[PDB]
Amino acid sequence: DNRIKTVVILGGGTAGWMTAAYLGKALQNTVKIVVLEAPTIPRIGVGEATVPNLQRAFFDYLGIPEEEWMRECNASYKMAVKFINWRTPGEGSPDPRTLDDGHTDTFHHPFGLLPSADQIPLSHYWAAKRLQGETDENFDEACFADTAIMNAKKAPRFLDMRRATNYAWHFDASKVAAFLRNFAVTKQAVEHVEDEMTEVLTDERGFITALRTKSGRILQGDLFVDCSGFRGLLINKAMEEPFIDMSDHLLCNSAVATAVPHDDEKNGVEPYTSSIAMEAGWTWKIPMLGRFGSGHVYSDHFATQDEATLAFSKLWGLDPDNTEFNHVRFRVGRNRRAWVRNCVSVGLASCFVEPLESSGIYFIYAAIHMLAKHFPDKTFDKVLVDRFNREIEEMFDDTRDFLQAHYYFSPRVDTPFWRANKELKLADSIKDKVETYRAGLPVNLPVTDEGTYYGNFEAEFRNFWTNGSYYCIFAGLGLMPRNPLPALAYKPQSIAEAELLFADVKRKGDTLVESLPSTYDLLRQLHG
Ligand SMILES: [K+]
């Protein structure tokens, strides 16, 4: 028996309890699991957004129904990230300004794969018509019916819970973590030790043999998972793995957040996350029932905590001296290696980017999934560790580049922050993709249908940011192809077939906007 016998997870929150619950299922009762988590001082719940695979890849794996967990964390529905004021100058405002060309400064990044005609995505037929003046429609409204549903604030399900569209979730992270702790302790026999870590004990090879807690108790184990957050108490301190700072790619390094009571009856509930451009970063808005989480992400090189706090307060008309605020300084980048010896980092201890595309929980689920597949024995085969590390670094570096593109192709030059973004270097892989896009070609064409894509985690993981996503961001920000895809000039029958697809998107939008309940009414039914 060369097998791991005990796994010790350092830290709770979403990373620790997701790791514990998932390995609890994956390891089929053959391994003892211990979580060491300090008792937490409650923070105001500032909200978290997600991607659509979360229910199939995580909660369904555990046998937890959607309704059951949503009801315990005041969850709500997300059909997109909506970008506001990313092309126009001025102070932070929740209200979209007007472009020079008359359009409102808003664009959406929704979920779902674009349809095709003649093996060409609908994106390309839209681009051809827009470049030739045959349409004035934006990409998002021409190509996704979700745009019209979100503009009317309708829900992504009917009141009988029939599905109408793709969606993800908004929720209180600290409640999801509590829900998962309860699940893991009562249904999977995870041991919860409520204490702080004071020592990390190592053998002659530098492998961890145990942690000591503040009370003096020693927790022995074979494999250690670092979910300790930005401090990286195992991976960075004890194992001495360097963190690669990537502030030469992304500038924001701080946030100030709160939760804002909201009149759902008067205003309705928006089925989407908003990203509101500010003078020295951007502000998230994550609606739940009765409230929204909000947070201004900023670079402390271009604004002081007080400046940021004032600009954030002015957005929502908060009184800055009579408001509860959380302040965070973050690490941007990743570890040189995520897994060293018998220490595997997951969550913030591993890697982090600002939540501009709701990547946080995804990075956790992906790391845990890959750990279960690369799960070691006590010989810790180096190839197994290497392959895991290689997946984590490519996943992170890919999303990092995608995020950088949101900033680099903003036309804003009104503040030193917006201008500073354009003096950073683009990474090679994203320069290559921009060039491809600019010639009218697709970037990262989806391999498969939407069922298979959101059904099989490996299919999404290998094609996470597809053609549709690059169009949403580049076209949204005003970067167009230099010309249409030249093949389209030879394909009049394919042009006409795409016209039918555009008409289908319009019909679906008009029909569903008439018949769907409001997001508010679906939430009221769900939360009982
Ligand atoms: K051991």
Structure tokens, 385: 């560790």
Q: Is 273 helix (H, G, I), strand (E, B) or coil?
A: strand
DSSP, collapsed to helix, strand or coil, labels residue 88 as: coil
Compute the distance between CA of residue 79 and CA of residue 155 in angstroms, rounded to an integer. 9
- Comparing CA positions, the residue from 48, 417, 428, 396 lying closest to residue 246 is 396
**Residues with active-site annotation:** 78
Tell me the C-alpha to C-alpha distance, in Å, between residue 452 and each of 123, 236, 242, 441, 462. 21, 38, 38, 24, 13
Q: How many CA atoms lie within 13 A of 471 on its CB side?
A: 27
**DSSP per residue, 341-403:** TTEEE-GGGTEE--STT--HHHHHHHHHHHHHHT---TT--HHHHHHHHHHHHHHHHHHHHHH
* C-alpha torsion 116→477→427→54, nearest 10: -60
CA of 226 to the centre of ligand 1 (A): 16
Name the phi and psi angles at 521, rounded to 5: -70, -35
Residue keyed to tokens 């997946």 = 391
CA 212-213-216 angle, 5° bins: 85
Q: Which of 68, 65, 67 is nearest to 56 (CA)?
A: 65
The encoded tokens of residue 222 equal 């074979």
Q: Has 364 been labeled as part of a binding site?
A: no
Alpha-carbon span 524 to 263, nearest angstrom: 13
Q: What is the side-by-side strand order in the sheet with 48-49?
A: 48-49, 168-171, 76-78
The 3-class SS string of 437-490 reads HHCCCCCCCCCCCHHHHHHCHHHHHCCCCCHHHHHHHHHHHCCCCCCCCHHHHH
Contact predicate 417/262, CB 8 Å: no
Whether 74 and 524 have beta carbons less than 8 Å apart is answered as: no
**Domain-wise residue ranges, the chain:** 1-528
* Residue appearing with tokens 């895809």: 485
Cβ atoms of 344 and 225 within 8 Å: the answer is yes
The pair of structure tokens assigned to 455 is 């059904």
Q: 44: annotated binding-site residue?
A: yes
Cα of 370 vs centre of ligand 1, distance in Å, is 22
Question: Rounded CA gap, 273 and 287, in Å?
Answer: 7
Does 184 show up as a binding residue in the annotation?
A: no
460 is in an annotated binding site: yes
117 assigned ligand-binding residue: no
Q: Is 255 exposed, middle or buried (0-12, 13-18, 19+ CB in 10 A)?
A: buried
**Integer Cα distance of 306 and 325 in angstroms:** 12
Q: Please give the CATH number for the structural domain made up of 1-528.
A: 3.50.50.60
Buried b (16+ CB within 10 A) or exposed e, 400-419: bbbbbbbbbbbbbeeeebbe
Token duo for residue 120: 């060409």
**Resolution in A, one decimal?**
2.2
> Using alpha carbons only, what angle is made at residue 13 by residues 10 and 14, rounded to the nearest 5 degrees?
110
Beta strands in 142-195 (DSSP E): 168-171, 191-194
The residues that bridge with 220 in the sheet, in sequence order, are 210
Buried b (16+ CB within 10 A) or exposed e, 215-227: eeeebebbbbbbb
* Structure solved via: X-ray
- The burial class, CB within 10 Å (0-12 / 13-18 / 19+), for 324 is exposed
Q: What are the residues whose beta carbons fall under 8 Å from the beta carbon of 391, sequence distance 6 or more?
A: 366, 370
CA of 210 to the centre of ligand 1 (A): 7
Nearest to 208 by CA among 245, 241, 244: 241
221 is in an annotated binding site: no
Site of tokens 């949101």: 406
Question: Is 197 labeled as ligand-binding?
Answer: yes
- DSSP 3-state assignment of 516? coil
Task: Please give the distance, rounded to the nearest whole angstrom, from the Cα atom of residue 1 to the centre of ligand 1.
Answer: 13
CA atoms of 254 and 305, how far apart (whole Å): 9
- What is the DSSP secondary-structure string of 398-431? HHHHHHHHHHHT----SSHHHHHHTTSPPPHHHH
Asked if residue 152 belongs to a known ligand binding site, the reply is no
CA of 380 to the centre of ligand 1 (A): 12
Interval between CA 366 and ligand 1 midpoint (Å): 26
Task: Collapse the DSSP code of 78 into the 3-class scheme (helix H, G, I; strand E, B; otherwise coil) and give the result.
Answer: strand
Distinct helix (H) and strand (E) counts, the chain = 18, 24
Alpha carbons 237 and 471: distance in angstroms, whole number: 41
Distance between CA atoms of 33 and 10, rounded to whole angstroms?
Answer: 11
Cα separation, 303 vs 254, in Å, equals 10
Q: Which amino acid is at 509?
A: G
CA of 367 to the centre of ligand 1 (A): 23
Cα 6 to averaged position of ligand 1 atoms, centre (Å): 8
Given a contact cutoff of 8 angstroms between Cβ atoms, the answer to whether 342 and 207 are in contact is yes
| Rg of the chain over all Cα atoms, to the nearest angstrom | 24
Tokens linked to 166: 């793709």
Contact 170, 292 (CB under 8 A): no
DSSP per-residue letters across 214-263 = TTS-EEE-SEEEE--GGG-IIIIIIS-PPEEE-TTT----EEEEEEEE--
Exposed, middle or buried, 527 (CB in 10 Å: 0-12/13-18/19+)? middle
Alpha-carbon distance 52 to 362, whole Å? 10
